[PDB]
Each structure stands twice: as C-alpha cells, then as structure tokens.
Amino acid sequence: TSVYLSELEWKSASTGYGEIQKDASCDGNTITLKGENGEKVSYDKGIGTHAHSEIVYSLEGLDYYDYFETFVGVDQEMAGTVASISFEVYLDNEKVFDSGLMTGDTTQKHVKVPIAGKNTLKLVVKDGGDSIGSDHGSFGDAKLT
Ligand SMILES: CO[C@@H]1O[C@H](CO)[C@H](O)[C@H](O)[C@H]1O
Ligand SMILES: [Ca+2]
C-alpha cells in the first residue's frame, strides 16, 4: 500500500549541517513537527535534514503508486530557536509544492502530489533567507501511496 522514502535509495543528496537521517531528525531524535491544535506531533518514519538540502529520488519501477505524501516543517527539537526554512517539492523539473517561510512554531504542512507519468522526485529545504542556523527541516511520514 505504501513505501517510505527512507526505505528507498536516493540518486543524490546533500545537507547543510551534519548528515541526512533516515527515520530521525537532524540530531537523531524522533521526527517531531508542530501540530494544528497546539501539539507536538511525532512521526516514526521520514527524513531528517538541514538547510541547505537537496535530495533526488528516481520513481522508476514504482508505477503502482499514485501520490507522494509527506508532512513538512521545522523539526520541533528546534522549537524556540532562530529556525527559518522553506520546503520545495519538484516532479520532473516542475515545482509542485512550496511551503513558504516556516519558523519554530509554524504549523506543519501536509503535501500530497500525484506521481502518475513522473520519473523524478526532488526535495529542497532552503535557509529562509538569513542563515542556516537552527535550520532543521524534517519530512514527516514521507512515503509513496
Ligand atoms: C548556532 O546554532 C547552530 O547552528 C547550526 C547550523 O550552522 C545547527 O543548526 C545547530 O543545530 C544549531 O545549534
Ligand atoms: Ca534560516
């Protein structure tokens, strides 16, 4: 029914600080994002990364799936910091999602884009236009469905 991105191997990957963490935040904690009702939300699966980050996945041999789905936001390990980022999703060189500026307490966003007839998925986490300081971006429950 679904395959998580952390169960797949990227073609290429980069991160601005530390290393990309599969099923964990940048600092190796459970991925947490700010909920819509004041809560801290935990995600068992996903990708923890840091601005500036770019990750590219091939969708070859994955024709079973209709959508790419993920939550995005500043990882809540960095709550109450200078954290400021944006998330961009690309499918075949076309931008299909842009989060805009997200800071420490910005409510998580919920991505769902159709992947039929698509070959390449690209994830971008940018630095909010100031610096990469505190810029822990997490992709919560990142999967193909
Ligand atoms: C001075 O703040 C630090 O900035 C770094 C990026 O340069 C990382 O985000 C660290 O987690 C953060 O604590
Ligand atoms: Ca920033």
Taken in order of first residue, the domains within the chain and their CATH numbers are 1-145 (2.60.120.1060)
Q: Which residues surround ligand 2, an ion (CB under 5 A)?
A: 84, 127-128, 130, 135
Residue 21: its H or E element: strand 21-22
Looking at the CA of residue 135, tell me the nearest atom of ligand 1: 9
Q: 3-state SS string over 104-135?
A: CCCCCEEEEEECCCCCEEEEEEECCCCCCCCC
- Of 125, 60, 121, 112, the closest CA to residue 91 belongs to 121
**Which region holds residue 16: left if phi is over 0, alpha if psi is between -120 and 50, else beta?**
alpha
Pairing relation of β-strands 84-91 and 120-126? Answer: antiparallel
What phi and psi values does residue 78 have, to the nearest 5 degrees?
-105, 20
CA of 18 to the centre of ligand 1 (A): 10
CB of 65 closer than 6 A to ligand 1? no
CB of 135 closer than 6 A to ligand 1? yes
Mapping DSSP to helix (H, G, I), strand (E, B) and coil, where does residue 5 land? helix
Q: How many helices (H) and strands (E) does the chain have?
A: 0, 14
Experimental structure resolution, Å: 1.9
What was the experiment behind these coordinates?
X-ray
